[PDB]
Amino acid sequence: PYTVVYFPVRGRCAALRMLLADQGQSWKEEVVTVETWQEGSLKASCLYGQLPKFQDGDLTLYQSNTILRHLGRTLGLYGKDQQEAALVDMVNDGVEDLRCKYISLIYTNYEAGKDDYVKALPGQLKPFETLLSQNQGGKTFIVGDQISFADYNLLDLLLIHEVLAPGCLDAFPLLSAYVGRLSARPKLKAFLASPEYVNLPINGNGKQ
Amino acid sequence: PYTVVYFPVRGRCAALRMLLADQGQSWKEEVVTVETWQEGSLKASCLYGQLPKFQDGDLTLYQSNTILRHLGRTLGLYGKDQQEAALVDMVNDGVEDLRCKYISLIYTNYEAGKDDYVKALPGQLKPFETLLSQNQGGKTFIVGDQISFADYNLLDLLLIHEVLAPGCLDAFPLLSAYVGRLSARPKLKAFLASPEYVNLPINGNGKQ
Ligand SMILES: N[C@@H](CCC(=O)N[C@@H](CS)C(=O)NCC(=O)O)C(=O)O
């Protein structure tokens, strides 16, 4: 079955976890501690020297988006055809791009860069609102009429940004409604409210 | 057919171009000039305000890796099964990660950061050598026994790094042989030697 090896934080595992929870899939969590990481062996055994590490049977994966695409592929959350699959990738690449900027701020220069980051945030969120406006008035999902792995990744990105900049979605009606709608999905709602999710920090340096 | 809209540089379009050339596909190049970009209208019309922009029929795409995955998916260069597709993604994510570091150096702090970057390079290339060593002794491709879009992306990454740090592949027999072998593919060889490729700078700021 599934095993996710990661630090005790939501981080880059939050989206795939929401995905697995919402899809009614079971998985095992293998928590890695500082001591363990700092010990070096595990790290050295990781393809790119980083976590998450994911196991699906004897298939061992690295890279959060690889895991997301794998689950999307095997679980049927990658578009209804090749055209939708491409749009799904386009959304996820966009999500990853903003996530990289967010991670840089959080771990690299939170104090000094927070103001500029937040001023620039609307410009960075606009593209997703636009995608939403172009797909059934933004009443279903980010791509097509079925959920995809990019939805889970985008939802996570929006969630962590509302904590960083409360009300940043006030300027985007479709995105706001989207967050509320997806967050209300029964299995996802229960997971998001659980101690398993709630009691984990968003990041590893205590900033958010 | 295919149309790629980009600046007159290899950059993030080099890999998908090598792919199209090697696969015997025809495409149109729409070159964007400073004046044109600086004008602002094109940029404003881009999903994430960036190029490349790709067109396949009435399907318009953005993000270099989205285009690579699209072509890999539609042309059959995405693994023989779901397991291989996942490994292909894992390699590409790794390639993208190093590419991001390379781009940062090139455009952000070439002079001051080149020494440290080059010292750290071996550690960054090691994972791809290992992947090769684990796939048929590294005698075929990065994943499986058929070429995939990750191969073209990795090949490009290795090619631009040899220019940045000549001989960086010397200590990696599999990667070295891999570059030579793939570069020798008839259609790819002809394309790489053509003025269309050769007379284009690697980057846009004249550094390499
Ligand atoms: N591109 C990778 C990034 C992985 C990454 O940044 N991992 C961090 C934590 S989220 C890590 O392993 N840090 C420990 C280290 O680099 O030694 C992915 O998407 O999974």
Ligand SMILES: N[C@@H](CCC(=O)N[C@@H](CS)C(=O)NCC(=O)O)C(=O)O
């Ligand atoms: N994640 C995007 C990055 C695209 C990107 O960085 N584009 C640059 C040139 S390679 C650009 O459009 N720069 C102009 C601008 O940002 O205004 C991709 O993979 O295509």
